[PDB]
Design a protein around this ligand. Structure first.
Ligand code: KJ8
Ligand code: KJ8
Lengths: 303, 303
């Protein structure tokens, strides 16, 4: 008695798409920028193509395929979806290219041009995607600014479901085992007990919001991961960003409550941030949105 | 019986202004970027500061002072004016900073972002300044894109009156002697007979317009200056720029008539270009104002 997953998994021919440039290469193999040209059509779809480091690791090949299953099962405007897989020596994942890269880097290299409208609209969009994932019974487990991609400056999508997990109808949490999840974005209960829920994802959403409001600051900049558990237990949290009114900062702090159920639901976060987005300057003070006695010569008239 | 020139020549103290960066250094000494802070006021005026190469040439020091006299005698929104001179070892000229540099370089390093509206509005503004100079009885003798400066992208001013000459009420032309005037911008009669009139300046205006429409192309790119006189005599002129309709190109060609009096007057050029500026796309075809089967993945829906 569980809803059959009738997602279609498209198998693409390597000849159909053309890699163009490497976009980056972390501990997750390499991601390529490319063009997908389905033979029959008269279309050319810009795509990102992801594959693991050339060799075959048994456990890592299972995991890509697990990530394919989740990306192939999600359909929503604020969530990156799988277009298909290409079955070469190593398996390749293909998705829509998000040309402007990840949001974390974007805010960093656009501080001086990011209005409060964009910031709050991003917050709404991330909450919508997350809320969609909650509907889909999916616990992301790796929400951060670095895992949100930018299609256009006004349109961002959640991505990177390498750690995601599907919950049963008769199931409310996920108990991890292996670990190695980014400590500075995880809820306390997850650090202490390896428990992950949708409310755990809300914690991470909180930190993600903090990242954006601080234009890409690293959470707990000096602090080594070993200490994190202690300081949270004590009742320490991320500071209030300079641009943040108490109204917005209070939303952040609510995400970081010890009682997970007291934290806001994503559906609520959409409402709250939506409301704020209609009057962005009441909620984020940003100077733009070295001299002030400067006057132009054809205003300084000859005395 | 000639109108007394009651222009005021302001003498500035070197202590009042602060050089900040060199802007450039040609055969004309160096031009500095600076801030002028008149002691009594609470103002800070951005300025360009021009001085000859450190040494004193007798003939060249006379000429700076001649250029000071003309800049100090002009007052108009489309013409750069002298703010003052500073009497140091070598004499310094001071004017309003035109931060965006000269127009020639501007069009070159903004081709891909310059609309037809900007182009035609520049043409109007240059004609207005030139027409003002004609009123002031002043023959510029060195109009080119490189001698028009940019205050803002929408506001340009004529400058560089090192070759300018003042005409008498009972006087219609200027007969040069020394020469070394840029050959590729001068009217034929000037090349042949060293005659310079306001209508000679219209020729130069023509070439200046050609420069802008070709986004900074060098006139007669292959041709050495010695040949120029011949080819013009034969009836050869600059080609029609790609973006130029026959309407606009015809204005250019009219500036290059052999009979100087047949050429348009600046007052007429203001009208004509003004008219065109109200419907810029009827007069300049620019593609913006490598694939066209490209479609975004969240429009290519799974077939
Ligand atoms: C894995 N995670 C913990 C690190 C986040 C990360 O590095 N993401 C990443 C890395 C490299 C490229 C991209 C990416 C880009 C891109 C574009 C321009 C500049 C920089 C990056 O554009 C993208 N469009 C879609 N997906 C992207 N990356 C994801 C992997 O995070 C992806 C690609 C292909 C198939 C599945 C997922 C991308 C995204
Ligand atoms: C002399 N002529 C034949 C060459 C044209 C030329 O090189 N003009 C020039 C050279 C160097 C600086 C400037 C200039 C700039 C500027 C600003 C940013 C980048 C590049 C250039 O800004 C200016 N503002 C006002 N005047 C300028 N130059 C003129 C001389 O052409 C000038 C400066 C000071 C006093 C009188 C005139 C300028 C202008």
């Amino acid at each position: 008695g569980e809803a059959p997953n009738q997602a279609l998994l498209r198998i693409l021919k390597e000849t159909e798409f053309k890699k163009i440039k490497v976009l980056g290469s972390g501990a997750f193999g390499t991601v390529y920028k490319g063009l997908w040209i389905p033979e029959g059509e008269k279309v050319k779809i810009p795509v990102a193509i992801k594959e693991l480091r050339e060799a075959t690791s048994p456990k890592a090949n299972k995991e890509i395929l697990d990530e394919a299953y989740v990306m192939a099962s999600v359909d929503n405007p604020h969530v990156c979806r799988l277009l298909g897989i290409c079955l070469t020596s190593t398996v390749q994942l293909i998705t829509q290219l998000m040309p402007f890269g990840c949001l974390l880097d974007y805010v960093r290299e656009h501080k001086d041009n990011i209005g409060s409208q964009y910031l709050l609209n991003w917050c709404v969009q991330i909450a919508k995607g997350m809320n969609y994932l909650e509907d889909r019974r999916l616990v992301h487990r790796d929400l951060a600014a670095r895992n949100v991609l930018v299609k256009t400056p006004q349109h961002v999508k959640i991505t990177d479901f390498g750690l995601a997990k599907l919950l049963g109808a008769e199931e409310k949490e996920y108990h991890a085992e292996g670990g190695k999840v980014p400590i500075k974005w995880m809820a306390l209960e997850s650090i202490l007990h390896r428990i992950y829920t949708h409310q755990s994802d809300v914690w991470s959403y909180g930190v993600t919001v903090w990242e954006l409001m601080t234009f890409g600051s690293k959470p707990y900049d000096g602090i080594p991961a070993s200490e994190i558990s202690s300081i949270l237990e004590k009742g320490e949290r991320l500071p209030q960003p300079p641009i943040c009114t108490i109204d917005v900062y209070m939303i952040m702090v609510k995400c970081w409550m010890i009682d997970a159920d007291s934290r806001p639901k994503f559906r609520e976060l959409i409402i709250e941030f939506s409301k704020m987005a209609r009057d962005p300057q009441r909620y984020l003070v940003i100077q733009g949105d070295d001299m002030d006695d400067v006057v132009d010569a054809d205003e300084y008239l000859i005395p």
